[PDB]
Amino acid sequence: QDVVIIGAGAAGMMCAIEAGKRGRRVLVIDHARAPGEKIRISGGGRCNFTNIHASPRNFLSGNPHFCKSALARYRPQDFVALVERHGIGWHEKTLGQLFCDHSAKDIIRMLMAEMKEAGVQLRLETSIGEVERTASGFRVTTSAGTVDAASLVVASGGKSIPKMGATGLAYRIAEQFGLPVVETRPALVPLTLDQAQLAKLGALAGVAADAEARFGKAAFREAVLITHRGLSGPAILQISSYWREGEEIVLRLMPDIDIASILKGMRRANGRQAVQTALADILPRRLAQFFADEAKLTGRMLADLSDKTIDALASSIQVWAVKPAGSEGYRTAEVTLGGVDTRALDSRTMQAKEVPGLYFVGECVDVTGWLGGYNFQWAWASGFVAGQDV
Amino acid sequence: QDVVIIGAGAAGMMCAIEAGKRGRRVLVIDHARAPGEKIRISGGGRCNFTNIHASPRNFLSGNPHFCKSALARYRPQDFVALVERHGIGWHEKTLGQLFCDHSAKDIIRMLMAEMKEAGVQLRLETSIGEVERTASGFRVTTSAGTVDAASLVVASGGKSIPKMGATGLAYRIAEQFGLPVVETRPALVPLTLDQAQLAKLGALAGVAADAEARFGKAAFREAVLITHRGLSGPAILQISSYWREGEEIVLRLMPDIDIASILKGMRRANGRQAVQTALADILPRRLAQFFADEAKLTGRMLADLSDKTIDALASSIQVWAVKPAGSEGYRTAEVTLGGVDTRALDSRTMQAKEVPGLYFVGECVDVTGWLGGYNFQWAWASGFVAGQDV
Ligand SMILES: Cc1cc2c(cc1C)N(C[C@H](O)[C@H](O)[C@H](O)COP(=O)(O)OP(=O)(O)OC[C@H]1O[C@@H](n3cnc4c(N)ncnc43)[C@H](O)[C@@H]1O)c1[nH]c(=O)[nH]c(=O)c1N2
Ligand SMILES: Cc1cc2c(cc1C)N(C[C@H](O)[C@H](O)[C@H](O)COP(=O)(O)OP(=O)(O)OC[C@H]1O[C@@H](n3cnc4c(N)ncnc43)[C@H](O)[C@@H]1O)c1[nH]c(=O)[nH]c(=O)c1N2
């Protein structure tokens, strides 16, 4: 072939299309029974396929400017234009998040059809054994035979959800060719609480609060879910990429309001209501009960509360420090932080600086998006950028 | 005198200080028994004395660029520097809002002391009868006698809270000298609901929700209060300056979350809970009961709810259109929108373009700040700018 791509996911199929459209004869190999398994299950089966605000600040990397070039060369609109062209209903939800109306599968079907038109060859349920450099490019050995190619594209994703065929193949190939690998971790993952915290929040399983999840300078406002394993909801998932074991996150419940103010207002205006009943006018019932207990104010009358006491109560709700036991790991993470070091890669090409004809695209790379369509957009953009050069 | 100022409020005393410090002999006249009565009662008696983000976008005007010059010449830091210099404890709350730690009166005492040092003369409980142009400047007639001055500064505020000595004096003087007056209205004011709306929200008096209050392109996220008169809380107050009679505002309750998502999640995860009980895991109890009733789902089991039904329920909570009966008017507004037309005023001076030696500062002018310290900062800046020229 002129081009062999490992992994028929978001980045791989995009690259395929662009290289097939250039008349380049391309072959895509994947160990799965079906292409784009993550696409398929993503955005709750709807696929949050991009985000209108996609830009360098929405990604974590060791070199923050690395993604600048690809992102500008392939924008959310460009992908939207592609979807509309295939009659795929889409809409925005919150925070710039674009979803399909019908199902993630429309997108798979689409990429598929685009590949068929571009002349690319797809081989599924095919495992990779080795890759060797050759005087002429590369040879890859597979459970189905061997292929030679001038260009080889590593588009095999990251470590999240092993059950779906996630592997670290990309990292093994990077190291094999001497490319550094930025240390990887489960990201956009729920966070665990220890048996004691879980006992204390015993009765709050199922509550869902509007909240800021803060770690130092990073803050996200979205739902926080309390479960029997601990903390999830989009705000946890976001901050989970910034947090590290041993550390505290700070939760601001009902972040747009000032609870101390409210409570003093209710104090004059009514006065003779129980504390937990005043809180229940502000928070879901179970949370109200919880915060009134912890503070030892249950059944106490709102008018008997000093200012100092109210401030402390508010503070317990709006500056709530939690120290997570850990993360739930790769069986539950949406994304892998870290990956093939960017410094070793051509920003406008995706090609290994040290190894002509070798390319790394998509999530396997040390560019990691916030939750909200940013990861798919990076997959798109970098697949596209490689597809122009490959 | 060299300079007579009408109104010993925020803008007037600031101007006084700056003109007194220049050796200009100044006199401040006020019909009140005490200076800075609004300062005194402002920020809940604490005084929200500025906002660190103060800038042109935080103000409504007929000429949006008018305030640019003054704001840059006198910044929140400049005022902070002044407070610290007088040993006045201050802190930030939310949204850039600076407050005193002790009381608004510290600030009054301070401005006072600064005036005494600057040599300015203060006359209180003194009413204004007329102002005439003179070959030499101005003559003002007062319940205490007459004064002549080369410069006359109108710093008499707006129409809000008549009980505290608010009057439209500024507007009467503008018109008398042919300066146009941008149409005035109660702003940062609660909004009223009609008897029918008030009956429907009968049982929600006292609830306080995190919410977005939206009118077209304007949106503010803060607390929304439901009372027996209707709607208040900072988010109402903010949007009230943008809204107009006959129109709708849209309320997004729990704006950082997607309730449709949450509810579908709770549907799989639990399933056999009553709708209103699922909502109570998200909203204060009374709101949960309200939204479940309106939608006619009370006691219904969360797993018997179609997607379409959930979407509609969510939408009722997060795209909630309300048509207000009116505003509560000037007895309750924090600020007056509109005022002396800016186009008629020197942006870098506050002087009437058509009338040498006549100046208009502070709230009487057609520059109106969002809630959060922006109005005091405009008072400061414009008082200061005038005080340099006067
Ligand atoms: C549940 C869930 C939900 C979402 C998301 C993830 C998850 C887990 N994501 C993240 C998103 O799925 C992710 O960023 C992309 O799929 C990455 O694109 P890639 O092409 O790089 O890898 P990708 O996952 O797409 O594909 C990698 C491919 O290589 C194959 N492969 C792996 N190892 C192999 C091997 N050893 N040999 C051969 N082939 C191998 C795989 O089977 C697979 O098809 C997301 N992102 C987003 O922007 N919006 C969203 O809504 C979501 N939602
Ligand atoms: C309850 C409340 C709370 C707040 C606020 C307002 C209110 C009502 N504000 C708004 C703020 O008070 C306002 O913007 C300023 O006081 C305006 O500054 P001025 O100097 O222009 O008028 P200002 O109100 O200060 O003073 C005008 C003066 O002229 C005098 N006067 C009026 N008519 C007269 C007449 N006919 N003859 C002689 N004298 C007359 C008055 O007695 C008064 O002292 C606020 N803003 C903010 O930035 N942060 C905040 O926290 C608050 N909080």
Short mmCIF file of C-alpha atoms and ligand atoms in Angstrom, two decimals, chain A residues 5-14 29-51 59 97-99 123-124 126-129 154-158 160-161 164-170 172 188 330-336 361-365 367-380 382-383, ligand 1:
data_model
loop_
_atom_site.label_atom_id
_atom_site.label_comp_id
_atom_site.label_asym_id
_atom_site.label_seq_id
_atom_site.Cartn_x
_atom_site.Cartn_y
_atom_site.Cartn_z
CA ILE A 5 -3.47 2.96 9.16
CA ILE A 6 -3.76 1.22 12.47
CA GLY A 7 -7.14 1.81 14.05
CA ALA A 8 -10.46 2.52 12.32
CA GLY A 9 -11.67 5.03 14.90
CA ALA A 10 -12.45 8.74 14.58
CA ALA A 11 -8.92 9.89 13.68
CA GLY A 12 -8.10 6.86 11.53
CA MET A 13 -11.06 7.00 9.28
CA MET A 14 -10.78 10.71 8.80
CA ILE A 29 -6.56 -2.40 9.85
CA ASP A 30 -8.48 -2.89 13.13
CA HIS A 31 -8.71 -5.75 15.59
CA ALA A 32 -12.41 -5.03 16.25
CA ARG A 33 -15.45 -6.63 14.65
CA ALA A 34 -16.78 -3.15 13.83
CA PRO A 35 -15.26 0.35 13.18
CA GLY A 36 -15.77 3.26 15.53
CA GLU A 37 -16.97 1.41 18.61
CA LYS A 38 -16.27 4.44 20.76
CA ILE A 39 -18.09 6.70 18.34
CA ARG A 40 -21.02 4.29 18.55
CA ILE A 41 -21.39 4.43 22.32
CA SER A 42 -20.32 8.05 22.69
CA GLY A 43 -22.56 11.00 23.67
CA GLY A 44 -24.97 8.47 25.16
CA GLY A 45 -25.31 6.74 21.77
CA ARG A 46 -26.01 10.13 20.16
CA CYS A 47 -22.37 11.18 19.73
CA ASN A 48 -21.23 14.54 20.98
CA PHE A 49 -19.29 14.93 17.73
CA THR A 50 -17.68 18.31 18.24
CA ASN A 51 -17.85 21.55 20.11
CA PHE A 59 -6.89 20.89 25.51
CA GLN A 97 -21.79 20.71 22.53
CA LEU A 98 -23.01 19.41 19.15
CA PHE A 99 -24.98 16.13 19.11
CA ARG A 123 -9.77 -4.96 7.27
CA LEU A 124 -11.42 -5.74 10.60
CA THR A 126 -7.23 -8.29 12.16
CA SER A 127 -4.52 -8.15 14.83
CA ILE A 128 -1.10 -6.48 14.58
CA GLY A 129 2.03 -8.53 15.42
CA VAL A 154 -0.87 4.94 14.28
CA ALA A 155 -4.49 5.77 15.10
CA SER A 156 -5.15 3.12 17.76
CA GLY A 157 -6.53 5.41 20.51
CA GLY A 158 -5.86 5.22 24.26
CA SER A 160 -9.96 3.75 28.21
CA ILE A 161 -12.63 1.01 28.25
CA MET A 164 -14.24 -2.24 23.81
CA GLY A 165 -10.88 -3.08 22.34
CA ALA A 166 -8.80 -0.22 23.78
CA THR A 167 -5.05 -0.96 23.88
CA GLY A 168 -1.73 0.84 24.41
CA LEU A 169 -0.42 -0.22 20.99
CA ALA A 170 0.47 3.38 20.09
CA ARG A 172 4.57 0.47 22.38
CA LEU A 188 -12.73 12.34 32.44
CA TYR A 330 -9.70 2.96 32.68
CA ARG A 331 -12.83 0.78 32.81
CA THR A 332 -14.75 4.00 33.29
CA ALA A 333 -12.64 6.91 31.98
CA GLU A 334 -13.72 8.65 28.79
CA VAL A 335 -10.17 9.59 27.81
CA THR A 336 -6.45 9.01 28.32
CA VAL A 361 -2.99 10.82 15.30
CA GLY A 362 -5.94 11.22 17.64
CA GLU A 363 -6.16 10.29 21.29
CA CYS A 364 -2.90 8.25 21.32
CA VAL A 365 -1.18 11.67 21.22
CA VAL A 367 -3.32 16.28 23.44
CA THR A 368 -6.33 15.86 25.75
CA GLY A 369 -9.67 17.67 25.40
CA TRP A 370 -12.18 18.70 28.05
CA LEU A 371 -15.43 16.80 27.99
CA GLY A 372 -17.91 18.21 25.40
CA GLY A 373 -16.90 17.16 21.88
CA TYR A 374 -13.33 18.52 22.08
CA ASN A 375 -11.73 15.05 21.84
CA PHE A 376 -13.63 14.12 18.68
CA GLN A 377 -12.70 17.46 17.15
CA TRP A 378 -9.04 16.78 17.88
CA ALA A 379 -9.46 13.33 16.38
CA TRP A 380 -11.04 14.92 13.28
CA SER A 382 -5.35 15.62 13.39
CA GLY A 383 -6.67 12.79 11.24
C1 LIG C 1 -17.98 6.31 26.61
C2 LIG C 1 -17.28 7.44 25.88
C3 LIG C 1 -17.97 8.52 25.42
C4 LIG C 1 -17.30 9.52 24.76
C5 LIG C 1 -15.97 9.41 24.59
C6 LIG C 1 -15.29 8.32 25.00
C7 LIG C 1 -15.94 7.34 25.65
C8 LIG C 1 -15.18 6.14 26.16
N1 LIG C 1 -15.32 10.32 23.96
C9 LIG C 1 -13.92 10.14 23.76
C10 LIG C 1 -13.67 9.70 22.33
O1 LIG C 1 -14.27 8.50 22.15
C11 LIG C 1 -12.23 9.60 21.93
O2 LIG C 1 -11.56 10.77 22.24
C12 LIG C 1 -11.99 9.09 20.52
O3 LIG C 1 -12.63 7.93 20.17
C13 LIG C 1 -10.57 9.08 20.07
O4 LIG C 1 -10.34 9.00 18.72
P1 LIG C 1 -9.29 7.97 18.14
O5 LIG C 1 -9.45 7.74 16.58
O6 LIG C 1 -8.03 8.44 18.41
O7 LIG C 1 -9.32 6.58 18.91
P2 LIG C 1 -10.50 5.53 18.76
O8 LIG C 1 -11.14 5.12 20.10
O9 LIG C 1 -11.49 6.19 18.18
O10 LIG C 1 -10.16 4.28 17.91
C14 LIG C 1 -9.02 3.60 18.13
C15 LIG C 1 -9.08 2.33 17.36
O11 LIG C 1 -7.99 1.43 17.32
C16 LIG C 1 -8.44 0.18 17.49
N2 LIG C 1 -7.44 -0.57 18.16
C17 LIG C 1 -7.06 -0.39 19.39
N3 LIG C 1 -6.02 -1.21 19.62
C18 LIG C 1 -5.81 -1.94 18.51
C19 LIG C 1 -4.87 -2.85 18.20
N4 LIG C 1 -3.97 -3.36 19.17
N5 LIG C 1 -4.77 -3.28 16.99
C20 LIG C 1 -5.59 -2.86 16.06
N6 LIG C 1 -6.50 -1.95 16.38
C21 LIG C 1 -6.62 -1.52 17.60
C22 LIG C 1 -9.72 0.19 18.20
O12 LIG C 1 -10.53 -0.92 18.16
C23 LIG C 1 -10.34 1.46 17.68
O13 LIG C 1 -11.31 1.37 16.71
C24 LIG C 1 -15.96 11.37 23.53
N7 LIG C 1 -15.27 12.35 22.88
C25 LIG C 1 -15.90 13.40 22.43
O14 LIG C 1 -15.18 14.35 21.80
N8 LIG C 1 -17.23 13.52 22.60
C26 LIG C 1 -17.90 12.57 23.23
O15 LIG C 1 -19.22 12.67 23.41
C27 LIG C 1 -17.26 11.48 23.69
N9 LIG C 1 -17.94 10.55 24.31
#
